[PDB]
Design a protein around this ligand. Structure first.
Ligand SMILES: CN1Cc2cc(ccc2S(=O)(=O)C2CC2)NC(=O)OCCc2cccc(c2)[C@@H](Nc2ccc3c(N)nccc3c2)C1=O
Ligand SMILES: [Ca+2]
Lengths: 55, 252
């Protein structure tokens, strides 16, 4: 599942025993209830540009 | 950087400037508050290990605007497989003596997981390369941080599209850029990021490593394939500092 379109995950993807898939996020992010989206939990999450984000 | 543009101040907030005795040495990428990823070849000629400084929040070299943060480099970690004066395994992991403070102008780039990087990021065609390197082959270096969008090539395609005693492109490298001599990263950009955008977030996929002259017709820029080093980097970031600046760590 993870090999194809990143398993639908916004960030990280783990394949499980069967047709199961778990999305995960980098530190400074938490996974939303959709099980795919990553939202920042910190003021300066990695890979995001504050001057562009605040625009 | 040849044929790019000024990176607008704060839009490349993970870019690091490395200095030795106050002189421009190389670029780097901030990946959290204390760790910087750069190129192993940046350190081949260093004797003054105690005079290595990393500057975050830098933009214009001619002026101090208050967003710059300088730190002493406490440790330089190079893979055992890297051989000085050669191209393979061109990566260094730098521990800062004190963490930088994250601000609108100082933000880490995400170091991705290996699977995500190989399965997904490796297929994002364009990525940004940046630095204060040469604006032209045999020309002056930049006073303002420059950025360039470059397309990635499969190694088979890089080997077929290239012209010309040149080194091989290993599984620890990838080509990116143009063969028409208009756009490239240069030697003064060495160690800087090759950053990839995916679903609203930027990740570290490459390091400015090597090539021929700068923006030389028939030649692409060659970048360290960061995905091969994820596990090696993570393990070292979990390790205790050791006496002495330079550390050679076993690879894999
Ligand atoms: C010529 N130099 C300088 C130097 C070299 C070595 C060791 C130390 C130093 S240094 O002390 O100056 C230290 C930068 C601070 N070693 C080698 O030449 O070994 C092979 C790697 C190697 C081979 C060839 C060139 C370079 C490195 C070059 N970098 C680059 C980087 C990206 C390029 C690109 N995208 N397009 C075109 C050309 C490029 C040249 C470079 O860094
Ligand atoms: Ca400045």
């Amino acid at each position: 599942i993870c090999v194809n379109e990143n398993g639908g995950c916004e960030q990280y993807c783990s394949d499980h025993t069967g047709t199961k898939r778990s999305c995960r996020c980098h530190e400074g992010y938490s996974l939303l209830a959709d099980g795919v989206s990553c939202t920042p939990t910190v003021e300066y999450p990695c890979g995001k540009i504050p001057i562009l984000e605040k625009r | 950087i040849v044929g790019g543009k000024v990176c607008p101040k704060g839009e490349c907030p993970w870019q690091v400037l490395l200095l030795v005795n106050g002189a421009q040495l190389c670029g780097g990428t901030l990946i959290n508050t204390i760790w910087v990823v750069s190129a192993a070849h940046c350190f081949d000629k260093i004797k003054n290990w105690r005079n290595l400084i990393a500057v975050l929040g830098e933009h214009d070299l001619s002026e101090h605007d208050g967003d710059e943060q300088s730190r002493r480099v406490a440790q330089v970690i190079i893979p055992s497989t890297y051989v000085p004066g050669t191209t393979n395994h061109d990566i260094a992991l730098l521990r800062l003596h004190q963490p930088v403070v994250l601000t609108d102008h100082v933000v880490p780039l995400c170091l991705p997981e290996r699977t995500f990087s190989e399965r997904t990021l490796a297929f994002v065609r364009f990525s940004l390369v940046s630095g204060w390197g040469q604006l032209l082959d045999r020309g002056a270096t930049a006073l303002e941080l420059m950025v360039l969008n470059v397309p990635r090539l499969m190694t088979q395609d890089c080997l077929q599209q290239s012209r010309k005693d040149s080194p091989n492109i290993t599984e620890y490298m990838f080509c990116a850029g143009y063969s028409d001599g208009s756009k490239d990263s240069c030697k003064g950009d060495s160690g800087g990021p090759h950053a990839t955008h995916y679903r609203g977030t930027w990740y570290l996929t490459g390091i400015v490593s090597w090539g021929q002259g700068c923006a030389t017709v028939g030649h692409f820029g060659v970048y360290t394939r960061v995905s091969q080093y994820i596990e090696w980097l993570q393990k070292l970031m979990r390790s205790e500092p050791r006496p002495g600046v330079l550390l050679r760590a076993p690879f894999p």
